[PDB]
Amino acid sequence: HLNFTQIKTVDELNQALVEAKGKPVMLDLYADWCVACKEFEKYTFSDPQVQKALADTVLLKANVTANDAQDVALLKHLNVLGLPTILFFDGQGQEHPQARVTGFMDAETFSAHLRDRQPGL
């Protein structure tokens, strides 16, 4: 498995970003009831090459299973309309919406995505 850092609230994301100054960041939105999210963990985040490509990236994950106030506020703040969703941030903590992943991608597809669209790297 890849080593993610759990963040819960909008401001935990913001702090995490401020701390990752100078480094590329990726945020995975996850939920227990999300099937394709599970596919990502089992088939994509598990790929040896995908992992090496993410070796020097700050990895963040928000677990939104409960769908509580904080989860909803976060999803709303990120303008996330569904799962799975992966966000990407540059060294200046700025997100690149044009780099979002909103469906499942297998290892190969995701590898090409990181190669062609990942910010800050």
Author numbering: 428 to 548
What is the paper's account of this structure, in its own sentences?
The transmembrane thiol:disulfide oxidoreductase DsbD is a three-domain protein responsible for shuttling electrons from the cytoplasm to the oxidizing periplasm of Gram-negative bacteria. Its role is very specific, to acquire reductant from tmDsbD and transfer it to nDsbD.
Despite the presence of reducing agent (TCEP) in the mother liquor, both proteins were found to be oxidized with a Cys-461–Cys-464 disulfide bond clearly present. Cys-461, Cys-464, Asp-455, and Glu-468 of Q488K-cDsbD overlay well with the same residues of wild-type cDsbD. However, unlike E. coli thioredoxin where Lys-57 forms a salt bridge with Asp-26 (equivalent to Asp-455 in cDsbD), Lys-488 is in close proximity to Glu-468, and the two residues have hydrogen bond interactions with a bridging water molecule. The Nz of Lys-488 has a high solvent accessibility (36%), which makes it possible to interact with the solvent-accessible Glu-468 (side chain solvent accessibility 36%). Asp-455, which in the wild-type domain forms a hydrogen bond to the side chain of Gln-488, is just hydrated in Q488K-cDsbD but still remains almost completely buried (side chain solvent accessibility 6%) leading to an elevated pKa of 7.5. The Nz of Lys-488 is more than 11 Å away from the thiol group of Cys-461; therefore, this positive charge does not affect the pKa value of Cys-461. The closer proximity of Lys-488 to Asp-455 ensures that this residue has a lower pKa value (7.5) than observed for Cys-461 (10.5). A pKa value of 10.5 ± 0.2 was observed for Cys-461 in Q488K-cDsbDred (closed circles); this is very close to the wild-type value of 10.6 ± 0.2. Therefore, we can conclude that Q488K-cDsbD has similar biophysical properties to the wild-type domain, and Q488K-DsbD functions equally effectively as wild-type DsbD in vivo.
